């Protein structure tokens, strides 16, 4: 309803669930099976406030890997202009996708420490239904960290249920607190 | 260089080489879709002048069907919100996929009507694909076919191969429009 633009990235190495997770974030519904792909989050500012505002979110899932060359680093820098919010992913069995966030977010500061980064930033990890009952505590705390680094809120789910976007739910009150806080930092 | 944004739609039948004619507007190269994809222009903003601004042209690919259901539609009129420019493909093989142009500029301009495009502000641009697979009979009755085609949109029109490098080369005449369109869709808007 409103013709503001909100521009939010979505990076994360490949296989981690970032076309799932977009895909949970727009059509509230399961992924059920190339380049830059952007899908559209109608997401209601201030709702039920005497400031609702229809905002339509963009949610840029940008590709490639952290290892290619500088010259193929600088033609994916196109897309970082005018970014309003970062959606991280990572894949909690994969401990390797974590680490690579780190290049990932200086990647977005090295052609646009963390501190002085006024972008605000969301870190979110997936496959967690593949998470042992003795590993959960294990990884959880290697996670937090990866939250302060970024100053960021953190969300784990599994992609693949339904119940991680319902209504209500503490995954879906981080992401609006999350999408508010994009629109608020000049939409 | 600049953080203004341009966003220019490219609608079309699907095949008629939507994602074909995109890289070659942006890698300058050849080509060698599941939902809405994404490619930047950098294009120079009047290039080789004092007031020469560096923008990031956004060239959002659209897919579906105009036969779709009219949900279908509402749930791709989202990606319709705030254009700058459309560019409308359309084959010339397939003489159906010049028909549903009109269906395609009107979901966009809404969200057959002589007015509708009499009136329209949006800089359109109509480009037909596979110029190269015409053979040397029917070509000139079918460029006439399309030259009432961008009449009737109130556009510029431009005809090419993008498995061609030289079709979109520069100094050609499908440059200099090309050029002269992203300008105006920068004119119609930030001045």
New interface residues.
């Given amino acids: 309803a409103s013709?503001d633009?909100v521009k939010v990235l979505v990076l994360g190495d490949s296989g981690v669930g970032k076309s799932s997770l977009v895909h949970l974030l727009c059509h509230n519904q399961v992924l059920g099976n190339?380049?830059?792909?952007?899908?559209?989050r109608?997401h209601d500012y201030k709702e039920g406030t005497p400031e609702e505002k229809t905002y339509?979110i963009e949610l840029?899932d940008v590709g490639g890997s952290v290892g290619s060359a500088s010259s193929v680093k600088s033609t994916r820098a196109?897309?970082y202009?005018?970014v309003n919010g970062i959606i991280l992913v990572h894949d909690l069995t994969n401990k390797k996708s974590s680490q690579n966030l780190y290049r990932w977010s200086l990647e977005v500061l090295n052609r646009d420490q963390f501190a002085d980064n006024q972008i605000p930033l969301l870190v979110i990890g997936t496959k967690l239904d593949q998470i042992h009952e003795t590993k959960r505590h294990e990884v959880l705390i290697r996670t937090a960290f990866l939250a302060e680094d970024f100053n960021a809120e953190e969300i784990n789910l599994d992609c693949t249920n339904p119940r991680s976007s319902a209504a209500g739910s503490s995954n879906a009150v981080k992401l609006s607190r999350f999408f508010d806080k994009v629109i608020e930092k000049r939409y």
């Fill in positions: 013709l633009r190339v380049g830059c792909s952007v899908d559209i109608v339509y840029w196109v897309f202009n005018s």
